[PDB]
Symmetry: D2
Subunit: 257 residues, 4 copies
């Protein structure tokens, strides 16, 4: 129960209490991963549900923006599981206030950059330190970062959100190179329009946009769509595809005229 | 009717296409192998992987023959669930663009781009008319990192593969409502007969760090990726491009 | 012996549309002009001569690659050298419709002109440029592709493919010509008011008015000409390999 | 009503920003120059070109000072026609990503990305409040090929520049109806203070052909490009990115 040769691979999913992160966690548990979930607060019903899929599941309280606590969080994961095979950088937030770029406030820019970009980058640094020190490597290893189609499609009413995600796109490319000899597959997943709490406030507009054809596959994405994709990348069949970006968007980001 | 999904793999007799065929067989697909060259010994070996396999002789460039080939695949299997556009050829000559000959440009374009486009058309006609759709469906097109990394000594090849990149995007839109996942796979430096003549120069480059993973790609690397996409988990990712290159195409300074 | 005193631009498909807007802009900047096209418009040539330089017409089918060497030699005989090549000649898809109905012969027609023809015409011109004994002016090759290189239209994939092939060609051409200090650029027009767009004016009208084009207007041939003339003047030599979108923002990916 | 257009060039006391300022002055612009520390001499160098030149002390990272800086510019010149976002800094330390310090990440992000974004915000407010628009208007942002080419030993620098790429795209949409051309310029390897400590590595790479044009870039190369875009001929190309790199960022195999 301390220092836990492991029989199952270990995925660390940030922001895994709900939404896309929970869909990812369910998919990884179904493919046979033990789960270390982080989030700002716990949901005991969630942990129970995930435990009903047959694997080991533990929750770790963490503010992704609090970079000074990341090393301790990674220590807690290692003490509970012995190693980390898959990191899913999922936790993130939308813009504090959508509106004219001329009204964008620096405090709001800072909040979202601190979480989505700065927090993700140094949480990844803390985990990679542990992965590179792993004495044994018996499972495929991956780092999957949930960015957004907003990395490559701009929304002028929330340029702080777009900038933070585009920064992740750049970070993934460099991280892939840094981890290539360690045989850690490094991938970017760009969700489009997914049914979660982050899109609930804009749900009516996105409804009509989806009926109008904005999304070529003409439906909302589900957290289980992103989860199936992430679990596919974490299984090891895509190791030689390190550096690839996957668009989990039903074709939304296909440029068309 | 059919109880196992059917993959049609062009150029599936050897190299990357054979790696893809093996990986799809392990994933539970029956196999329609097409190629302009026959090798029944390879077909026999594929049958050892547990599924049904049939071979169809086809020249990818001979677009007037594609309809009959697709009809023959339908006759044998009743339907097509996955198309892998793998058949292709390298440049006839490598050398100064100033010496590029239009006949050699034509040979490569007729196979890699024109042939792939209209062979895909013939298969899509069949897929859109499927009575039953019981398995995930996909069209996976093997282009190359040469779609996005230029080689001035073989611009005809690079152009043919860049054309495939554009075709894939439009095809994904056309087939989105039919729920056929449409993907591009860009192999980097893979150990096949296509790289055989330059195998010593690439051996040197791979060691020197040109490929961040510092190894040859294998047909089985591309096969595992293609089989991952064909299983259905990536349907909502239609239009995606996957680099099967150990990091080769990551732009770095 | 005394080399030419004005730079020479060869503009393919320069009889009308974007090619003519490019020709007018280059003539105003002091370029002599070698215009190629399938048919001549003598009134156009006279109009271009009104700007004060030498203008000469050369009948050429861009798809007829066996004739390109003779065309280039005829330009050299008349002008002594080529400083700027504008690859502008091109055609729209023969028929817009479902990809399932696309015909190989129509695919070939578009590919033979837009892609194959452009590539080997460029090859013929580059042979001449690399043999030039004197280089007194900035040199460039500017290729008019399209936003369709990077924005797909499933009802005319042959056209998109032909232009996406040009994008790849321009990147390798820029590498081949970097030591010769020939600036190689791609220009991607968006929706421009020419005979190529006249049949779909109604649909583009509404897209434009609705802000699909962020600048909310049709492009004109003079918009592309101003951009091309800017590139041909030499200030962009160190930007070789760059692509310019002449589209009022159309191709900015937005959500 | 002012009779010459006014360009505001950040970080314009040396290097690329000074080359841009020189190029704009030669094209008939008056110049408002900023930099962190005072400079009495750059005015006299630029004044030889015949226009009006003024220097303004401004820390680009100090967003609360930006409003006063812009007002000081308006007081001296009446309006701003062209903004060149040139000020920036390289990574505080190069080294393994594993050792990247958050404080150094913050310093570079505060200047290159956050500072640029909110200084543009302040300047744009002035431009949209203009009574008179007699000259072509533009905003040219100097990012880097590091926006699109990764350097794992300085990922903070790359991320800050990639953020600018996204910013410029959204800014171009925001200003499209105001007829303000919005452009990104990506320098490659330019001979300035910023490359001085790695000039030996870059000499070997440049001579080896990493840069296809096989020479160092100079401040006047970027300046000629930026002045080209500021002249109005590229207004219908708003949103375009120009690579000022001698072909460095052309992806090649
Ligand atoms: N939902 C979409 O349509 C969509 C589209 C593109 C990208 N994304 C990205 O997907 C990811 C998941 O978002 P979602 O849609 O599931 O939203 P969500 O709000 O439903 O779930 C996000 C989870 O992350 C947690 N989280 C947020 N900030 C955190 C912090 N500072 N520390 C720790 N945990 C934190 C939240 O508490 C929550 O449990 C985000 O990165 C988001 O930007 C979502
Ligand atoms: N090997 C690499 O490093 C590499 C890299 C990037 C892309 N690719 C692409 O991968 C694909 C497979 O190539 P490979 O490396 O396995 O080479 P390969 O030559 O070993 O195999 C190609 C197969 O396709 C068949 N084929 C060729 N021309 C054909 C035609 N006209 N009609 C029908 N079948 C035809 C051949 O008979 C052979 O069985 C090609 O599209 C190639 O361009 C290869
Ligand atoms: N109009 C637009 O909105 C738009 C957008 C993007 C790209 N383009 C491209 O701009 C270029 C110019 O087109 P345009 O809009 O001016 O159309 P256009 O039809 O008005 O003019 C094209 C000119 O090229 C000539 N030409 C065509 N095929 C030729 C051939 N085989 N050989 C020689 N000359 C030939 C024609 O005779 C004509 O004079 C083309 O490459 C086109 O694809 C146009
Ligand atoms: N030199 C290259 O090879 C290269 C390549 C790509 C991009 N760039 C970019 O070009 C721009 C100019 O850099 P350079 O090469 O001329 O280097 P430089 O150091 O010589 O010039 C940058 C100037 O900006 C000033 N500056 C820095 N931080 C500032 C701040 N907070 N507020 C105000 N002024 C500030 C510096 O004092 C200096 O005068 C930078 O954005 C740099 O990132 C340079």
């Amino acid at each position: 129960h301390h220092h836990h040769s492991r029989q199952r691979p270990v995925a660390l999913v940030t922001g895994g209490r709900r939404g896309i992160g929970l869909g990812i966690a369910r998919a990884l548990a179904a493919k046979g991963f033990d789960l270390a979930i982080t989030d700002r607060e716990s949901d005991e019903a969630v942990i129970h549900e995930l435990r009903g899929l047959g694997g080991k599941v533990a929750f770790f309280k963490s503010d992704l923006a609090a970079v000074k606590t990341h090393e301790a969080t990674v220590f807690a994961v290692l003490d509970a599981f012995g190693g980390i095979d898959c990191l899913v950088n999922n936790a993130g937030m939308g813009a504090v206030e959508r509106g004219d770029f001329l009204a964008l406030k620096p405090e709001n820019f800072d909040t979202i950059m601190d979480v989505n970009l700065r927090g993700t980058v140094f949480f990844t640094q803390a985990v990679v330190k542990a992965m590179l020190a792993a004495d044994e490597v018996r499972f495929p290893r991956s780092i999957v970062t949930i960015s957004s189609v907003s990395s490559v499609m701009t929304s002028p009413e929330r340029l702080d959100y777009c900038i933070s995600k585009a920064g992740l796109t750049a970070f993934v490319q460099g991280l892939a190179l840094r981890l290539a000899e360690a045989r850690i597959g490094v991938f970017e997943v760009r969700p489009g329009i997914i049914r979660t709490d982050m899109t609930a406030k804009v749900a009516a507009r996105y409804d009509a946009l989806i009926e109008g054809g904005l999304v070529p596959m003409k439906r909302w994405g589900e957290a289980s769509d992103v989860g199936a994709i992430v679990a596919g990348l974490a299984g090891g069949d895509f190791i030689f595809a390190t550096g690839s970006a996957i668009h989990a968007d039903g074709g939304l980001s296909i440029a068309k005229l």
